[PDB]
Amino acid sequence: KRIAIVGAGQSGLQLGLGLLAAGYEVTMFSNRTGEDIRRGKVMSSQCMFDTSLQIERDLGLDHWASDCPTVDGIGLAVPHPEQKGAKVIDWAARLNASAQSVDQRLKIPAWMDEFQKKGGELVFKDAGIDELEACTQSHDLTLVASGKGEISKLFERDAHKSPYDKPQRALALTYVKGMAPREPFSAVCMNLIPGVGEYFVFPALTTTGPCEIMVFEGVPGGPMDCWADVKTPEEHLARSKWILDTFTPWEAERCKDIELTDDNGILAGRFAPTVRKPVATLPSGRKVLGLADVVVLNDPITGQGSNNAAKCADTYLKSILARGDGAADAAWMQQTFDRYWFGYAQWVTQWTNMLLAPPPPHVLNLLGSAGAVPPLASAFANGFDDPRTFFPWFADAAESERYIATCAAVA
Amino acid sequence: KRIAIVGAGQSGLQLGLGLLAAGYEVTMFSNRTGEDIRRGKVMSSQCMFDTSLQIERDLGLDHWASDCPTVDGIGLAVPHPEQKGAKVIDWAARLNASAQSVDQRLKIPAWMDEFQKKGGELVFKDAGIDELEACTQSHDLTLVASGKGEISKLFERDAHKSPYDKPQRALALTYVKGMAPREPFSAVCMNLIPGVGEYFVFPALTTTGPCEIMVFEGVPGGPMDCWADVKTPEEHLARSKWILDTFTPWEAERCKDIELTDDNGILAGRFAPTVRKPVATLPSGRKVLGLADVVVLNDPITGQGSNNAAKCADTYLKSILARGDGAADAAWMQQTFDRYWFGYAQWVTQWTNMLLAPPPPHVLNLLGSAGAVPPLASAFANGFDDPRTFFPWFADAAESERYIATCAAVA
């Protein structure tokens, strides 16, 4: 009946709003005001594919569906090693159903407002152990949904599920107005720069209206690990254009007139992919359950964290409702996570962690073959809505050849 | 707009009813009358877990929810090698949400009636190539949902996805009244007889009311491959009791007064697990798409075929609706299957095919440990609602030990 959530983010607010609609009392702790979120720095590029969007629709939370531009496909390009300014791989495929990117600076504050209107108890505090000890005495279940916040480290890192202990990419975001729209359909335009990094770009909705989000990922120490000397929004926009001019001149043609959406429409950072154990034990001996990025944190290279957050909150909501009047004990907590991990997130995580490493030959062959086998390009693109569908053919050479043949037979 | 389906079974009727509700015209071919199905031989033990049941509920097709007894857990027993009449493993765990078994002799005819009432065009014919050639000219998509019927062999067997080319178990069913109900909760009572076979029993609903279904699976050539000399319903009931008396005397105690529900409440047969390619090309060059057991046929040992059929028809329905006015071409057909297979059925199939082979030591250790680690028994039982959750720990020794420890830590 009474549920506490620490962290008013994507997963926490989605879960809390779903619980309020199911008749629960919900207490939520936020460490920021809605307006400070709206006007602060961007946090994500939040490209959500149709399955995730549908979870929001089923809860009545798709408040920006008509205003947010759709992302209608996925494109992949690789620079040509010899031919200057050209591409050796350049293909695209349409998504079976649109994706959408609604700036968390819009969504989270609006969902905070809705949470209050629907009877939630919003408490404004940077929560720590004392708040978790208090919550665990007055609530039937307490979840930690604090994303990358320091309190997420209460949960023990799971070494076996975490192959990396260091960041594998240097990240940056740039929200811009003025970019030439993609024709004849919008897409996530992926640009893979061998041994250097990746640039992704797609339309989105932010606090000043429709835009495009530039996403940069650089191999640490390399030419796209280039944000440390950037100290002003103007320097950040300049650096963004320098990457395109240097590595993706075909995308620079779309950017002759770009401007930041706002001075806080920029981000630079990095983190190590990490999986954690879901049950944390407080000094009192009482227990809390971690949600979404607290327990499974992937590098953004595959565009999956928000998708994972919506699917994780959906799985946890269903588990809570199915438990009914039963106690939310450690066993129940652990099984709830296990269903998320073994059923889904282990495959998103293995796929993303593989793609962070240098691509093996059979992967380069897949990417080339997709350009000449449209069913394979379509399988690649739509796999982003459910990355389980990449296994076993993406990771294994022999299986990749079998799947290429399957796709070729229906081309 | 116009869809044809050959085979009025679980998957075909579920899909057809979902398409009619979405505004499509649907033509369906049945090779039997509803009454001949109601009064004919049983076809399945159709134990459906909550995710599958929920697919039926979301379509308004759970017409027997209140009359059908619930199956509330899963139990596992193994005879003791030394101690006579005793068990060395004997444990149970509650399902997070109930399962239900509604005799296909009840469900399929009732869904056939509903299909007509909702505007479907039901055509009564044993359909063959000529009907598929006619359908493919007058309909936008033609699916074959004929289960184990001979026409299913139009689709090419997929050797790489089919490790077996012979039956791995001799099957039998016995629907009975009078069995002592299980206390204190109902369950699928699994009995694993090392090197011989398996006996499963659980409550269900049939045409004469609530019953229990006895399910026998025998290693070919062994003592539970014992149905060839059975030629009358009385001999079939006697043989059923002989198995329990010989191998599971603890279950015989529940059966002192059992009687067949009806003389057609019996079945004996066998088949080779088979996966097929989903697109078949007719002599004209036009194409048809296989559904459910036509393309993925598993031995019943894991209780998954009906569950797969409901999840396959749900995936195909969603794919059709998402395709909208687009052509149902071979590429679309193949991608629809690929999403079912790579996303879900490959894992159900790998798990079931492993369990048909002799269990390795780490599996026997898992089964024993589940009896002393209740979180592990619960993970095992609830894995039947989504067998993806068994990977990778069920199939690998080191991973199994890790998961045992995870479960032990929350016990």
Ligand SMILES: Cc1cc2nc3c(=O)[nH]c(=O)nc-3n(C[C@H](O)[C@H](O)[C@H](O)COP(=O)(O)OP(=O)(O)OC[C@H]3O[C@@H](n4cnc5c(N)ncnc54)[C@H](O)[C@@H]3O)c2cc1C
């Ligand atoms: C650069 C970048 C690009 C990305 N691009 C994409 C993309 O294109 N597609 C995609 O799907 N995902 C993407 N992601 C991932 C996605 O943004 C996250 O995975 C998602 O926000 C996770 O949701 P969450 O609920 O777990 O955490 P969050 O949404 O981060 O919410 C956690 C909240 O808790 C707050 N909090 C922290 N500590 C406390 C405390 N002690 N008390 C109270 N509140 C606290 C935090 O400030 C935050 O507001 C990207 C991530 C990054 C960094």
Ligand SMILES: Cc1cc2nc3c(=O)[nH]c(=O)nc-3n(C[C@H](O)[C@H](O)[C@H](O)COP(=O)(O)OP(=O)(O)OC[C@H]3O[C@@H](n4cnc5c(N)ncnc54)[C@H](O)[C@@H]3O)c2cc1C
């Ligand atoms: C002994 C046994 C026990 C089982 N126990 C379980 C269990 O406990 N749980 C579980 O989930 N699953 C179980 N299954 C599996 C389950 O019964 C099937 O997987 C499920 O019925 C498959 O659905 P379907 O739509 O593909 O085919 P079906 O439901 O078999 O439908 C196919 C229909 O098409 C008809 N047909 C065939 N040829 C033609 C033609 N040319 N023209 C017209 N119609 C035609 C067939 O007669 C049939 O009516 C069991 C199966 C067996 C054999």
Ligand SMILES: Brc1ccc2cc[nH]c2c1
């Ligand atoms: Br597809 C896709 C969508 C968004 C992002 C952000 C980084 N990589 C991505 C891939």
Ligand SMILES: Brc1ccc2cc[nH]c2c1
């Ligand atoms: Br669990 C379960 C449920 C039904 C059947 C039928 C054969 N084996 C089964 C396992």
